[PDB]
Ligand binder design. Sequence first.
Ligand SMILES: NC(=O)c1ccc[n+]([C@@H]2O[C@H](COP(=O)([O-])OP(=O)(O)OC[C@H]3O[C@@H](n4cnc5c(N)ncnc54)[C@H](O)[C@@H]3O)[C@@H](O)[C@H]2O)c1
Length: 198
Amino acid sequence: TYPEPTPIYHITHIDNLKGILRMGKLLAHNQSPPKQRSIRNRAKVPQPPGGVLHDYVPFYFCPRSPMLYAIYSGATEYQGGQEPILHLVSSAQAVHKAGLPFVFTDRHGVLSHARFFRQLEELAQLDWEAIQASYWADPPELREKKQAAFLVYKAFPWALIEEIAVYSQRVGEEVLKILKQFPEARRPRVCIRKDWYY
Ligand SMILES: NC(=O)c1ccc[n+]([C@@H]2O[C@H](COP(=O)([O-])OP(=O)(O)OC[C@H]3O[C@@H](n4cnc5c(N)ncnc54)[C@H](O)[C@@H]3O)[C@@H](O)[C@H]2O)c1
């Protein structure tokens, strides 16, 4: 079995929010998103619609990801830390109800041994205890499975985002200031969630 609804999470720097609201969508790497801050070109997707991982907008099935810990620890090229990083929240069911092409994996999608699925019933193939683990570093099988991904082909409409989660009051205020510049954009919930950060 699997959680229903099935939340999906995309992390991005706050400096990218204006470009997302202006476009009305997240764009996949290969669709040239007007990103301001960076925080897969040969990793083939074997389910339709195919292409490579950079053809999809990527989500995890958990907040507080290993990627976020690399950002927190200054391991990434980006050196601004976790506090300006938003979690944009949707659900796998909303994507499927919208008829958007998607695939998802049972583990880190860059792994040659990742399995890919295209039907929400196959969410049962994922390791939900690994996805939800707070102590995820070891063993390797667990860490790989924590990074199961939900991939939406080409573009992801802003209207499907139900919540922007933030680290702090100050970041929440900055998000509300940006949303107010786009009065016709859907206004999701804005929530401070320290338990989603390190
Ligand atoms: N970001 C995540 O939550 C996430 C989820 C699962 C997997 N991953 C893995 O991490 C890698 C790096 O992730 P990434 O987030 O750099 O990946 P990405 O390939 O999605 O990079 C695109 C960047 O542009 C931003 N962006 C998209 N549309 C935009 C728009 N209209 N205006 C401005 N900015 C826009 C995205 O938020 C992101 O920061 C991925 O290639 C994947 O292997 C990331």
